[PDB]
Symmetry: D2
Subunit: 66 residues, 4 copies
């Protein structure tokens, strides 16, 4: 459907976010995992904004419609 | 390569695990996110064992080789 | 008050849980952090059950009333 | 001892951080839990810097010496 949850993950260098986990890979890189919930369209747009940022690599969005 | 990190995510109902996050979706379902690190082969085998379990659905493994 | 959030943390070896994080300290010990929300009385009882378990050490409950 | 792990938790509005979890309480407040590891002195200083920030409330540091 259009409503559900999603997992956005990416490596670095809003009422949509349920929880976000930051895990350090090394001195320069942080692995970030964000659990999102709401309208899948708003979820995609959130991921869009994140992936558009410099320093953000390997962005992946796993959608989980209800 | 063969060594790096990985993000295994799945909905429910080892020295490989760096951190695991459990988030409740509702009364019956828990979204689980596991951050793994080590040999990508051991990582895949870990995911294999998890996905083979009854009650585990929508399993996804995102690999991040160094 | 009686309703709010709480952080239960402990070292190892329900609709109350919002999210739980497991972090490995070493081969034998896992640091677990549980974010709880609901009636502070139910929260305390949840922590009670966890701390009563063998293998669970250094249990600490930080309450955050609304 | 002086080396070990620690859990720093606080409500909002480095090679020391192992993992950090952000959980939304509501529109304005985010509950943040940081798992730290290293010299307990460096850990305390990290917590000091965080708690000194405006908007940061209910800061608590649970130390876990090895
Ligand atoms: Zn981060
Ligand atoms: Zn980082
Ligand atoms: Zn779970
Ligand atoms: Zn669950
Ligand atoms: Zn655990
Ligand atoms: Zn463990
Ligand atoms: Zn936060
Ligand atoms: Zn926040």
């Amino acid at each position: 459907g259009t409503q559900g949850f999603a997992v956005l993950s990416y490596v670095y260098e809003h009422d949509l976010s349920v929880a976000t986990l930051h895990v350090h890979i090394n001195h320069d890189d942080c692995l970030e995992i964000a659990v999102l919930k709401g309208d899948m369209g708003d979820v995609q747009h959130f991921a869009d904004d994140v992936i558009a940022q410099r320093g953000v690599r390997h962005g992946h969005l796993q959608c989980l419609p209800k």
